[PDB]
Amino acid sequence: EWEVAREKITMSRELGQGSFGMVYEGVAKGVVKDEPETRVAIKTVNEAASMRERIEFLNEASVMKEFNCHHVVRLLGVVSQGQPTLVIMELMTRGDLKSYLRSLRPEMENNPVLAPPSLSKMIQMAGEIADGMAYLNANKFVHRDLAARNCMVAEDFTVKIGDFGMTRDIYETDYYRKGGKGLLPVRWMSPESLKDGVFTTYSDVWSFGVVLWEIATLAEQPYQGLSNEQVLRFVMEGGLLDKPDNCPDMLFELMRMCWQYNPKMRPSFLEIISSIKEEMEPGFREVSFYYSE
Ligand SMILES: C[C@H]1C(=O)N(c2ccc(S(=O)(=O)C(F)(F)F)cc2)C(=O)N1Cc1ccnc2ccccc12
């Protein structure tokens, strides 16, 4: 079904170190309808892994087999015969959103443009990110690590929901062992998740508000001036991120709606999209989950 000729897959270079194995970048022969070749991201499984691990790999991959959204990085077949287990996916040529935002900084430094930022561009990303998340939540899937570093940028600048899931030494401090038991993205977590360690769609929305803050600051780390333990106390007691410098008032208002203390009072991704859909580009209606059937 999704199994594909491993011979029809040629790895080029490396993108990063995955959990089950190194992640490469290459091309696939006939993996997309009406397409000869296709740039893709190759996910592998180090031979130094038993079946207890190998099977787990194809377990989480079968989860994506049910996903089909313009705003979520799509799966493209899988390999697991007479060679190392592999999984193929749509390749996002501009990388993750945090790196992309960060790479814009130098330009903006020596760029002779003293004009406010484009609210229009930020809304496009917001809606694409919110549309991909609405789709995921609709399929009873909670992300648990929504952050700019886990959003991907396409060649055409479209943003899609993914999960970097690779080494990344530059974002290691984005995680903290709240209680030893695993690395958690504490600066992106809601008050309730910081307490019981439970993630829901309500908390994905809180994280969404933080991603909007990341976009407006060109990915500065949330809660400047506070250590991890200080962030914990501050957020759990009702503290909130500050309005970014030169942030369109409308964007911050959206953020604040995402950061209400009472989880049940936060709007859902569908409500978020409904309140900004009239600001979305024309094409949005064509390929978005929101307008779909
Ligand atoms: C590691 C690889 C991967 O498997 N996923 C991924 C996609 C969808 C889902 S999902 O559907 O379960 C959900 F979205 F719901 F999480 C989960 C994970 C990425 O985003 N990756 C990074 C990546 C891909 C493609 N191109 C890249 C280019 C640069 C860096 C990293 C790139």
Side-chain angles (χ1 to χ4, degrees), residues 21-125:
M22 195 69 80
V23 185
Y24 305 114
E25 184 199 313
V27 183
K29 310 182 69 173
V31 294
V32 186
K33 180 182 177 61
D34 302 358
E35 285 184 57
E37 279 177 47
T38 307
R39 301 187 63 180
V40 300
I42 311 299
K43 213 179 186 180
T44 73
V45 191
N46 191 296
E47 61 270 59
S50 59
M51 309 183 86
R52 190 183 188 69
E53 301 174 299
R54 294 197 299 174
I55 299 182
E56 184 192 309
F57 186 70
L58 293 81
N59 284 310
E60 193 172 298
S62 292
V63 179
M64 294 189 270
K65 298 180 179 178
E66 182 187 300
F67 303 147
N68 186 55
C69 177
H70 188 65
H71 301 127
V72 181
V73 179
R74 218 187 310 292
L75 176 67
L76 299 179
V78 61
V79 182
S80 53
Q81 310 301 305
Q83 251 190 300
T85 306
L86 311 180
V87 173
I88 299 72
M89 305 161 276
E90 166 192 2
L91 186 282
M92 303 302 281
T93 61
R94 288 182 199 286
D96 70 278
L97 187 55
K98 184 161 186 179
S99 297
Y100 175 71
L101 293 173
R102 278 264 127 187
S103 73
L104 296 179
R105 282 185 159 260
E107 315 180 64
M108 288 188 77
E109 201 183 15
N110 279 307
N111 189 54
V113 178
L114 281 51
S118 179
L119 199 204
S120 186
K121 292 292 186 184
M122 304 191 281
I123 294 296
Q124 309 311 146
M125 311 188 117

Side-chain angles (χ1 to χ4, degrees), residues 19-236:
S19 304
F20 296 66
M22 195 69 80
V23 185
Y24 305 114
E25 184 199 313
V27 183
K29 310 182 69 173
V31 294
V32 186
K33 180 182 177 61
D34 302 358
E35 285 184 57
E37 279 177 47
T38 307
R39 301 187 63 180
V40 300
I42 311 299
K43 213 179 186 180
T44 73
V45 191
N46 191 296
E47 61 270 59
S50 59
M51 309 183 86
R52 190 183 188 69
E53 301 174 299
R54 294 197 299 174
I55 299 182
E56 184 192 309
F57 186 70
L58 293 81
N59 284 310
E60 193 172 298
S62 292
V63 179
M64 294 189 270
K65 298 180 179 178
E66 182 187 300
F67 303 147
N68 186 55
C69 177
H70 188 65
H71 301 127
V72 181
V73 179
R74 218 187 310 292
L75 176 67
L76 299 179
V78 61
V79 182
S80 53
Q81 310 301 305
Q83 251 190 300
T85 306
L86 311 180
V87 173
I88 299 72
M89 305 161 276
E90 166 192 2
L91 186 282
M92 303 302 281
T93 61
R94 288 182 199 286
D96 70 278
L97 187 55
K98 184 161 186 179
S99 297
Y100 175 71
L101 293 173
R102 278 264 127 187
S103 73
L104 296 179
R105 282 185 159 260
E107 315 180 64
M108 288 188 77
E109 201 183 15
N110 279 307
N111 189 54
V113 178
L114 281 51
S118 179
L119 199 204
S120 186
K121 292 292 186 184
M122 304 191 281
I123 294 296
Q124 309 311 146
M125 311 188 117
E128 302 180 304
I129 290 165
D131 187 59
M133 288 304 292
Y135 176 77
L136 289 167
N137 283 174
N139 291 299
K140 307 312 185 73
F141 178 102
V142 177
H143 197 289
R144 300 194 178 202
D145 196 5
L146 179 53
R149 58 178 177 275
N150 290 322
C151 290
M152 308 301 312
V153 183
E155 180 68 21
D156 64 318
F157 293 101
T158 302
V159 176
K160 306 193 178 192
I161 303 296
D163 188 83
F164 195 104
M166 293 186 275
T167 169
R168 255 177 169 183
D169 179 59
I170 57 180
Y171 305 139
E172 75 183 309
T173 54
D174 275 6
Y175 298 90
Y176 177 60
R177 293 177 190 288
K178 197 186 70 165
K181 177 199 170 190
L183 295 167
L184 295 170
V186 301
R187 292 170 193 268
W188 279 264
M189 294 169 59
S190 65
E192 69 268 19
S193 299
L194 289 175
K195 290 163 191 175
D196 70 358
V198 177
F199 298 86
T200 66
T201 67
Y202 307 118
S203 66
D204 270 338
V205 166
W206 171 292
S207 291
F208 179 68
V210 176
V211 175
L212 293 185
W213 190 88
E214 283 186 279
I215 292 172
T217 58
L218 290 188
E220 272 291 299
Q221 188 168 64
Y223 306 100
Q224 288 294 124
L226 302 185
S227 59
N228 296 314
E229 289 297 326
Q230 286 185 295
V231 173
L232 300 189
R233 185 189 186 188
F234 183 73
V235 177
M236 285 183 269

